[PDB]
C-alpha cells in the first residue's frame, strides 16, 4: 500500500536506512489501554514510530514523527519502569509547555532511553 | 507516579 490509514512502509527497509542510528521494538500504549506493537526508529534529528500492521507481515504505518529538539520530558513509571512516557513541546526556566505525549512500553527501557537521551544531547 | 529520566534544561 501507499496509504492504509496512514503511510505504509516496510519495517525492515526502514531499519536499514542510513539515517537510522537506533531501533527499538515496543508497544505504544493508549489511554484506552490498547497496545500496538511498534518500532521506535531514532535518527540524528527525529524519532519515528512505526506501527506494525498485523494482517500484513513486515509492514507498518508511519504512526508519528517527532523532532528530538522538541522533547522536553521523558519519564518512566515507578510501578512499571519499562513504561516510558515522552513529552513534547517547549521548556524554559518558568516551566514547560506540553504539546504532545506518546507512551511506549519498551523492552530495554534503560538502554533505549539512554540512547535517545544521548541523541537529544 | 513517575521517575524523571530527562527534562530539558534541568538534567543536562
Numbering used by the authors:
A (entry chain A): 556 to 676
B (entry chain B): 255 to 266
Can you quote the paper on this entry?
The Golgi-localized golgins golgin-97 and golgin-245 capture transport vesicles arriving from endosomes via the protein TBC1D23. The amino-terminal domain of TBC1D23 binds to the golgins, and the carboxyl-terminal domain of TBC1D23 captures the vesicles, but how it recognizes specific vesicles was unclear. A search for binding partners of the carboxyl-terminal domain unexpectedly revealed direct binding to carboxypeptidase D and syntaxin-16, known cargo proteins of the captured vesicles. Binding is via a threonine-leucine-tyrosine (TLY) sequence present in both proteins next to an acidic cluster.
Peptides corresponding to the relevant regions of syntaxin-16 and CPD showed robust enthalpic-dominated binding to the C-terminal domain by isothermal titration calorimetry (ITC) with affinities of ~1.4 and 10.6 μM, respectively, and a stoichiometry of 1:1. The previously observed strand-exchanged dimer was absent with the homodimeric C-terminal tail–mediated interface being replaced by the peptide. Thus, the structure elucidates how the syntaxin-16 peptide binds to the C-terminal domain of TBC1D23. The peptide extends TBC1D23’s β sheet by adopting a twisted β augmentation mode of interaction with strand 5 and buries ~670 Å2 of the C-terminal domain’s solvent accessible surface area, a similar sized interface to those seen previously for other trafficking motif–binding proteins that have a similar KD of interaction. The Thr212 in the acidic TLY motif of syntaxin-16 packs its methyl group against the alkyl chain of Lys628 that orients the hydroxyl group toward the solvent to stabilize a somewhat strained backbone conformation. This allows the side chains of the leucine and tyrosine residues to be splayed apart and simultaneously buried into neighboring hydrophobic pockets in the domain. As a result, the acidic residues Asp209 and Asp210 of syntaxin-16 are in close proximity to three basic residues (Lys632 to Lys634) in the C-terminal domain of TBC1D23, which would allow a direct electrostatic interaction. Lys672 of TBC1D23 hydrogen bonds via its amine group to the carboxyl peptide bond of Lys213 in the TLY in syntaxin-16; mutation to alanine (K672A) weakened binding ~20 fold (KD ~ 30 μm).
